């Protein structure tokens, strides 16, 4: 989908700031940020997976290979029998993939090994597939074809009459990086706020409905180190403040932010952002974050999930790894069990984003029962100084890059 990108709607009107002061001055009323619904409860706090996934992987294999029900558990397997086993994968011997790894398939009961034509550099420990082949003289199970649950059901987001934007940013990384990282950051804030730019920019920035910061806002003797870490947080407060005073802002915990390291990271503590928390517009959300903005279902994490799949996969492109999880109906299979897996898509998001990617990324993908889903990999602003702006009435991501001249 291309139309209604930011730059376009932005240049949509005459310039004005290259002229002597006029009295008449435009001041824009932001869009009604009234239609929102945080829905990340299921984030506020391997059999079970296999149990929930089973119905899915089965109905996928059943359609993928027809009535010919290979539905046979790991126990009911008759050597040399062509069937379909549904289970969990385990691997064993930058990236920790081994020259030659191996995939063992676990059933609730036993666990069989795997041969055949199945990519290992691609799949990783925790995936839940529908394998097809027969048990061999080797004792190992040879595979000829496998599939995954894919995308869950998904009703279409209602139509919007006027474009609404969602600014996705990530990796502000306060603490280190050099003041250039700063001006850039100021410029970022100042654009959404309404400080810089001409009426065109402004009137469109004005159309931004919400701002999501996805983790890593702060990044990492004792005497000064403390002060520093304290200062940083302070700034982030100040930034969050300016933002809060202008538009709704959702903050997501990251790598090493004051909260649990495990995956469903619980929100940050209000005790950190005195200045900002004063605003009803600020909101500290869970890690894997879900919400429905202006009728569009968003879901994203501050990165980690993809960061891991990367460590144990061969996949290079994060945008891919991201698409991967969406196809494997599991936000982060690389994560441990603890009793419904929250990380299994109940319905399919409209926009699915990802944490501190090293580069901006975007792609729209479709699914079996034609579903539409916009993926986004929000770069680490710290080193990129970029963020995506998603227009919700068209699903168009477009990066925004800030910069200021250097000595040259």
């Amino acid at each position: 989908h291309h139309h209604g990108m930011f730059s376009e709607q932005a240049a949509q009107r005459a310039h004005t700031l290259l002229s002597p002061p006029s009295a008449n001055n435009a001041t824009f009323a932001r869009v009604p940020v009234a239609t929102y619904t945080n829905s990340s409860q299921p984030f506020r706090l391997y059999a079970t997976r296999l149990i929930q996934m089973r119905p899915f992987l089965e109905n996928r294999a059943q359609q993928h290979w027809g009535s010919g029900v290979g539905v046979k558990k790991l126990c009911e397997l008759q050597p040399e029998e062509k069937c379909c086993v549904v289970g969990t994968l385990f691997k064993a011997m930058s990236k920790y993939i081994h020259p030659d790894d191996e995939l063992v398939l676990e059933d609730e009961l036993q666990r069989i090994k795997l041969k055949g034509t199945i990519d290992v550099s691609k799949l990783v420990t925790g995936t839940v597939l529908a394998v097809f082949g027969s048990v061999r003289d080797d004792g190992k199970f040879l595979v000829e074809d496998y599939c995954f649950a894919d995308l869950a059901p998904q009703k279409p987001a209602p139509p919007l009459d006027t474009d609404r934007f969602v600014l996705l940013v990530s990796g502000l990384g306060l603490g280190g990086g050099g003041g250039e990282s700063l001006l850039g950051t100021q410029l970022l804030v100042d654009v959404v706020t309404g400080q810089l730019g001409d009426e065109g920019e402004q009137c469109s920035a004005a159309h931004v409905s919400r701002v999501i910061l996805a983790g890593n806002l702060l990044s990492h003797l004792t005497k000064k180190t403390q002060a520093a870490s304290v200062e940083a947080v302070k700034m982030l407060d100040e930034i969050l403040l300016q933002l809060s005073a202008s538009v709704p802002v959702d903050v997501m915990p990251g790598e090493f932010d004051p909260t649990n390291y495990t995956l469903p990271q619980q929100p940050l503590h209000p005790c950190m952002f005195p200045l900002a928390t004063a605003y009803s517009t600020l909101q500290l959300v869970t890690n894997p974050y879900q919400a429905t903005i202006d009728g569009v279902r968003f879901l994203g994490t501050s990165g980690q999930n993809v960061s891991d799949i990367f460590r144990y996969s061969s996949m290079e492109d994060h945008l891919e790894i991201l698409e991967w999880t969406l196809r494997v109906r599991h936000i982060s299979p690389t994560a441990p069990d603890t009793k419904t897996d929250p990380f299994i898509f109940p319905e399919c998001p409209h926009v699915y984003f990802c944490g501190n990617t090293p580069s901006f990324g975007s792609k729209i993908i479709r699914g079996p029962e034609d579903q539409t889903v916009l993926l986004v990999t929000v770069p680490d602003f710290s080193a990129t100084q970029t963020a995506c702006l998603v227009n919700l009435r068209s699903l168009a991501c477009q990066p925004i890059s800030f910069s200021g001249f250097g000595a040259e």
């Binding site: 990108m5 930011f6 730059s7 376009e8 932005a10 240049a11 310039h15 004005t16 700031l17 290259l18 002229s19 002597p20 002061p21 006029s22 001055n25 001041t27 824009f28 009323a29 932001r30 009604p32 940020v33 003041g179 250039e180 700063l182 001006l183 100021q186 410029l187 706020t193 309404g194 400080q195 810089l196 730019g197 001409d198 009426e199 065109g200 920019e201 402004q202 920035a205 004005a206 100040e238 403040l241 300016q242 005073a245 202008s246 538009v247 928390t277 605003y279 009803s280 517009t281 901006f360 477009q398 990066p399 925004i400 890059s401 800030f402 910069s403 200021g404 001249f405 250097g406 000595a407």
Partner: protein, 143 residues
């Protein structure tokens, strides 16, 4: 009226030797962020026609679309006076152009342009969106 903000700015640049960014002037004279920009604009033209060679340096904010490989990226940049033409050209469709700062002495990097704005903020931390071109019904201290 007008002849007033003009002197004010002169006293700032030339006499005080301060770096004048729209934001900074905005808060300083208490004026709409845009009208502040328009103010700098008028001030340079005068001082420029006046001396035709007065020690004055300007920086602009240029923003627009810049396609790299079929994929359109929006760019927002604070540039040094000269380069403005160059940057402006590289853009596919240009959205915003306006003065950003005014300084007597040229700046090595855009660095100070932050510091300046950052300080004046810490002192106004109280009301950031006061002179913004955007007002938000919800941004009212309640939660």
């Amino acid at each position: 009226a007008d002849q007033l903000y003009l002197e004010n700015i002169d006293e700032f640049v030339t006499d005080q030797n301060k770096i004048v960014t729209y934001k900074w002037l905005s808060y300083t004279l208490g004026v709409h962020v845009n009208q502040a920009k328009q103010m700098l604009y008028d001030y340079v033209e005068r001082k420029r026609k006046e001396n035709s060679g007065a020690q004055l340096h300007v920086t602009y904010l240029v923003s627009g679309s810049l396609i790299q490989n079929g994929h359109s990226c929006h760019k927002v940049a604070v540039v040094r006076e000269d380069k403005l033409e160059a940057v402006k050209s590289k853009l596919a469709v240009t959205a915003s152009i306006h003065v950003y700062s005014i300084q007597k002495a040229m700046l090595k990097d855009s660095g100070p342009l932050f510091n300046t704005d950052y300080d004046i903020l810490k002192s106004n931390l109280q009301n950031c969106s006061k002179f913004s071109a955007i007002q938000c019904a919800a941004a009212v201290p309640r939660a």
